[PDB]
Write a protein that binds this ligand. Structure first.
Ligand SMILES: N#CCC(=O)NC1CCCCC1
Ligand SMILES: N#CCC(=O)NC1CCCCC1
Lengths: 264, 263
C-alpha cells in the first residue's frame, strides 16, 4: 500500500483468501469490512499516527458512530481488490472516513463505504465536539474540497434508523465474543457487530439473495464479558430488514441498522 | 506465492494485519493457523487441485485428524512472515501436511507445524484407508525421501492425548459458531476449534504467558446448529489438558494439550 501522488488519500491491493469467502466463493461483507479497517489503519500509520498529538495529551480517541457499505460485486477467491481511502473533517461534529473498492483487473468500482467518527474521552467515555487545535492538526492530511464516496443528495448513508419494536420477526440469542473478536486493546472489533446483526437474517435469505447495502449505528460497546441478542424484522425482487442488537439481560441497546438484499 | 524450483513444496509471504494481532501487538495462534490453511490451499491449486480425480468419482475427501503447532516468535503487526509447505504420503494411514514459518527479514525459523489427514467418504462420513490409485496420483507432488517439520525421535507432535476427567478446572460453556466461522462448504473452519479450546484458558495465563505449543485431535465435526463446551485442567512453564464436547449429550468433538512459557 501507499499514499497517492498528492498525499491526500491511500491505496492498497488485497488478494482474497480461501477462508475469507462464503458459500458463493466470494468475499463475505465481514471480510470486506476487515479490509476497509486494515487500509484505514495503514493510511493512519503512513501519515504519522489515529490519535493526534493533542488527542494523546487530553486522553481522547476516535470512535465509530455509523458505518455504511454498498457492494455491487463481491470479489471472488483469488481475485485482487484495490481499495482507496481518505478522511475528511466535518466541522465540530467529528470526522468521516470514506472508501472506494475496485476490481484490480478491470478498474471498475465494485463497492463503496463511508463511516462517521466522534471524539470521546478514553476514561469517562464522554462524547465531545472536535476542538480547533485537533481540527487544524488533521486537516493537513485531508482534501480541502469535499470528496464523497456517496455524493447523491438523497443517499441511503444519511438516513435516520428507527428502533425495532418487540416482537421481532427473527432472533438469534446469547451471542458472545471470543478472543478472536477482540482488537489489540481488548475491545470488541467493530466488524463483529456486523456479523452479529447478520446472524438473525434467515439462512434462506442468505442462500437466495446477495447483501447489497448495510447501514449500522453504534450506540454503545459490548464488553468482552457481555451477551448479546440479535433481532430482525422484514420492512419490505428486493428485501429490506430492520435490525437491533441489545444486551441479553436488561435489553440495553448496543446497535441498530438496516440491510437491503437483492435476489440472485 | 509460488512452488519452489523442484516443484515439491510451496512458499508464500504475508504481511501481518492490524485486526490479526492480539494485546501483545503480535499475531494470534488463530491468525497463524489461518495463514497455514491459506498457503495449504494455494499449494493444492498450484499443482492441479485437495480432491484428486479418483477421489471426486468415489465421493472421497481429506479431513484433519490432528494438528500440531510450535511457535518460537509470533510476528508483529506489519512484519512479513514467509511460510513453506509440503505434503507427504503416510502409506495406507493417510497423508501429512507440514509447514515452516520464517521471519522474511532475518531468514530465521520462528515456527513450525504438522497435520495428519485421513480419507473419508463425503456422504456416509466413514473413514477409509488410502488406496494404491490415490497413492500414485499424490506421490508426483510430494518429496520421495522423508522431509519432516518435526524430525526428532519421540517429539511432541506424535504423543497420545488423554481424555479430561470431570470436574474440569476451568470451563467456557454455550459456544456457538456464527457464519464467519464457516468455510465455503458451510462446515465449521478447523481454526474455530483452536479458538474454542483457548476460550477456557484463564485470562491471567494469556496476559502473563505466551502459547508455545498446541496439539489438537479432531474426533467429530461441530455442525453449524451445535453448541459446544470448552474444558481445561492444568496438568503441570504451564501445561493444560483440553476437551471440547457438545453442550447437551457431552459427545466428544476435540481433545488437546497446550504448553505456555512465562513472558
Ligand atoms: N478501526 C478501524 C479502521 C477504520 O478506519 N475503519 C473501520 C472501523 C469501522 C468498521 C470497519 C472499518
Ligand atoms: N483445509 C485446509 C487448509 C490446510 O491445508 N490446512 C489447514 C487445516 C487444519 C488447520 C489449519 C491448516
Amino acid at each position: 500500500g501507499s499514499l497517492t501522488e498528492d498525499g491526500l488519500s491511500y491505496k492498497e491491493k488485497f488478494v482474497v483468501r480461501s477462508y475469507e469467502v462464503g458459500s458463493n466463493k466470494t468475499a463475505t461483507v465481514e471480510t470486506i469490512a476487515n479490509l476497509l479497517q486494515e487500509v484505514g489503519c495503514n493510511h493512519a500509520q503512513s501519515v504519522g499516527f489515529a490519535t493526534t498529538t493533542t488527542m494523546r495529551k487530553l486522553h481522547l480517541i476516535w470512535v465509530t458512530a455509523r458505518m455504511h457499505i454498498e457492494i455491487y460485486k463481491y470479489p471472488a477467491w483469488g481475485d485482487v481488490v484495490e481499495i482507496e481511502t481518505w478522511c475528511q473533517s466535518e466541522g465540530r461534529i467529528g470526522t468521516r472516513r470514506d472508501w472506494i473498492l475496485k476490481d484490480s483487473v478491470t478498474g471498475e468500482v465494485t463497492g463503496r463505504a463511508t463511516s462517521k467518527w466522534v471524539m470521546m474521552n478514553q476514561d469517562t467515555r464522554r462524547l465531545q465536539k472536535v476542538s480547533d487545535d485537533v481540527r487544524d492538526e488533521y486537516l493537513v492530511f485531508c482534501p480541502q474540497e469535499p470528496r464523497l464516496a456517496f455524493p447523491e443528495e438523497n443517499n441511503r448513508s444519511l438516513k435516520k434508523i428507527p428502533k425495532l419494536e418487540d416482537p421481532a420477526q427473527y432472533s438469534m440469542i446469547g451471542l458472545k465474543p471470543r478472543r478472536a473478536d477482540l482488537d489489540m486493546n481488548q475491545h470488541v472489533n467493530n466488524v463483529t457487530y456486523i456479523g452479529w446483526v447478520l446472524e438473525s437474517i434467515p439462512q434462506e435469505i442468505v442462500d437466495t439473495h446477495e447483501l447489497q447495502v448495510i447501514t449500522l449505528d453504534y450506540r454503545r460497546e459490548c464488553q468482552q464479558d457481555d451477551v448479546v441478542d440479535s433481532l430482525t424484522t422484514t420492512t419490505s425482487n428486493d428485501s429490506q430488514f430492520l435490525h437491533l442488537l441489545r444486551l441479553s439481560g436488561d435489553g440495553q441497546e448496543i446497535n441498530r441498522g438496516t440491510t437491503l438484499w437483492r435476489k440472485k
